[PDB]
């Protein structure tokens, strides 16, 4: 499903992303926008045989298992298919584990290139949270 901006914001807030390990809600809404335009079914195939899945484009080489990715570590202990659900539960759980790695949201290139150091709060402003 394709989330509306505020709709995803409300959902992400309910899923405890507002201020998780020091990152405000806007950071996550912004990251979702640039990673997949709020599309839970977004997928991106990579040259190394791995694929990025979901609204936060999580990779199958390190984070989830799709049963066909060379050297998969499945750090999030989940099938990549769980990351394509209209229910963002799994994508959020995994995103939290990723951000708990020593590099914060820098794990997401799109966030680094389009959200980092910006007025990310603008992404939730206007929404009734």
């Amino acid at each position: 499903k394709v989330f509306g901006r505020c709709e995803l914001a409300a959902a992400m807030k309910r899923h405890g992303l507002d201020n998780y390990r020091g990152y405000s809600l806007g950071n996550w809404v912004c990251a979702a926008k640039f990673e997949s335009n709020f599309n839970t079914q977004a997928t991106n195939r990579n040259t190394d045989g791995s694929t990025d899945y979901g609204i936060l484009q999580i990779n199958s080489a390190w984070w989830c298992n799709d049963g066909r990715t060379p050297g998969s570590r499945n750090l999030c202990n989940i099938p990549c298919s769980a990351l394509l659900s209209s229910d963002i539960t799994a994508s959020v759980n995994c995103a939290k584990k990723i951000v708990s790695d020593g590099n914060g949201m820098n794990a997401w290139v799109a966030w680094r290139n389009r959200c980092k150091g910006t007025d990310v709060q603008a992404w939730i402003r206007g929404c009734r949270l």
Epitope: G16, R21, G102
Partner: antibody, heavy 113, light 108 residues
């Protein structure tokens, strides 16, 4: 059949270093984040720290700079080292994966002279 | 550090009855509150993660609710094997911290 087995000196003297090994079997160290938790005599739990897939560590400030968590990907083990211990470090130590779905048996390390 | 306060300290119950355990955080932690059970001479066992998400393999009588600074672990009809310690733990901010725990004891 994922199992975590803790091992290390059950007795350490004040000012010495407490060391514990978490041997993981049925799973790989590089396939998860690993944590160390301790339970004091009165049922008080303290999260000591964890080490991520990248090797980055997060230590509880309560432990000052006495704690060190490392891993050995070839032996599939991660280790906890706590230096300059005092009787207050006497506790049951547990290792677990960051998800909290897998836990070691728990080893009581007593600090005494 | 976020302080988690659990109550009651001890809860006596007759098997078959339902009970609710409380955990309050000194600051908002969203849904980043997890519930652990720990029985005598055993390691902690994860029951509920992220306030209300069930852990595959945990009995359905266990459920969690709440958000922000107020959380509740509910046990619909406590059973014989459910007595022991229950702790809540937050993962919203480092360092992770645990509540003081609630002892579930058998009423006689």
């Amino acid at each position: 059949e994922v199992q975590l087995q803790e091992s290390g000196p059950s007795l350490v003297k004040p000012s010495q270093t407490l060391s514990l090994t978490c041997s993981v079997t049925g799973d790989s160290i590089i396939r998860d984040y690993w944590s160390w938790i301790r339970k004091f005599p009165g049922n008080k739990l303290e999260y000591m720290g964890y080490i991520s897939f990248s090797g980055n560590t997060f230590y509880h400030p309560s432990l000052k700079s006495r704690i060190s968590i490392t891993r050995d990907t070839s032996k599939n083990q991660h280790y906890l080292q706590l230096s300059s211990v005092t009787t207050e470090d006497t506790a049951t130590y547990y290792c677990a994966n960051w998800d909290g779905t897998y836990w070691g048996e728990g080893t009581l390390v007593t600090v005494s002279a | 550090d976020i302080v988690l306060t659990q109550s009651p300290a001890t809860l006596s119950v007759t098997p078959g009855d339902s009970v609710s355990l409380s955990c309050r955080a000194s600051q908002s932690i969203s849904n980043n509150l997890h519930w652990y059970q720990q029985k005598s001479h055993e390691s902690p066992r994860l029951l509920i993660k992220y306030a209300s998400q069930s852990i595959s393999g945990i009995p359905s009588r266990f459920s969690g609710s709440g958000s922000g600074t107020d959380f509740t672990l509910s046990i619909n009809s406590v059973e014989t094997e459910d007595f022991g310690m229950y702790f809540c733990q937050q993962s919203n901010s480092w360092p992770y911290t645990f509540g003081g725990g609630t002892k579930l004891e058998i009423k006689r």
